[PDB]
Structure formats: structure tokens, C-alpha cells
Design a binder for this molecule. Structure first.
Ligand SMILES: [Cu+2]
Length: 108
């Protein structure tokens, strides 16, 4: 938790679109089993990728406006942002191994 950014629809532009460096955004919602599976995986990734990546989370039941703008369908959906643009997309729950391979491939 501590270094992971809790996003709102208000702050999304400043925190993600204007941020320097890669930001991985987790679009999640309440009552979501797959969302709960990857939540400790992302607290680990936040520590292991420190200096290379910032992790941020946006709960769509409390923040209904940003996800329609990115065409989000399945929840959870992870979007890797770089310089304000969507660099890569992964949707669905995945293991720690799969997430590391996805990040190592795309942080290049
Ligand atoms: Cu922490």
C-alpha cells in the first residue's frame, strides 16, 4: 500500500496523464474476486519496481467517469501509461509471474 496512488476522477489527469515515468493503473471495483486476488501482487510489484514504475488504483464504483473514456470492459483491467498515453493493456486476474513478464516486456 503506502507508495501506491489512490486515484479519483478529479485527480486522474494530474496523477496519470501529467506524471513522469511509467504508471501502471489498476481499474478495479467492489465485490470483485479477481480484483482481490491481484491486490497483494500489486503491493509486491510496487516495491520491486520502485524507481522504474509507479502503481496507482482507481475504484470505478466510486469514480464512474474515467473508465468509459478508455473503453474498459472486463474488471480488473491494468493499463500501463507512459507520457500520458496507454502503452499496454492487460485485462483479467493474472499471477505474479505473468505480471512481471508483462511489465518487463513493456517497460523496455
Ligand atoms: Cu507501502
Amino acid at each position: 500500500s503506502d507508495k501506491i496512488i489512490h486515484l479519483t476522477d478529479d485527480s486522474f489527469d494530474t496523477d496519470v496523464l501529467k506524471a513522469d515515468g511509467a504508471i501502471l493503473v489498476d481499474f478495479w471495483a467492489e465485490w470483485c474476486g479477481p480484483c482481490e486476488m491481484i491486490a497483494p501482487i500489486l503491493d509486491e510489484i510496487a516495491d520491486e519496481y520502485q524507481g522504474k514504475l509507479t502503481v496507482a488504483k482507481l475504484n470505478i464504483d466510486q469514480n464512474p467517469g474515467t473508465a468509459p473514456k478508455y473503453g474498459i470492459r472486463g474488471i480488473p483491467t491494468l493499463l500501463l501509461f507512459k507520457n500520458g498515453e496507454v502503452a499496454a493493456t492487460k485485462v483479467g486476474a493474472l499471477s505474479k509471474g505473468q505480471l512481471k513478464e508483462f511489465l518487463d516486456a513493456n517497460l523496455a
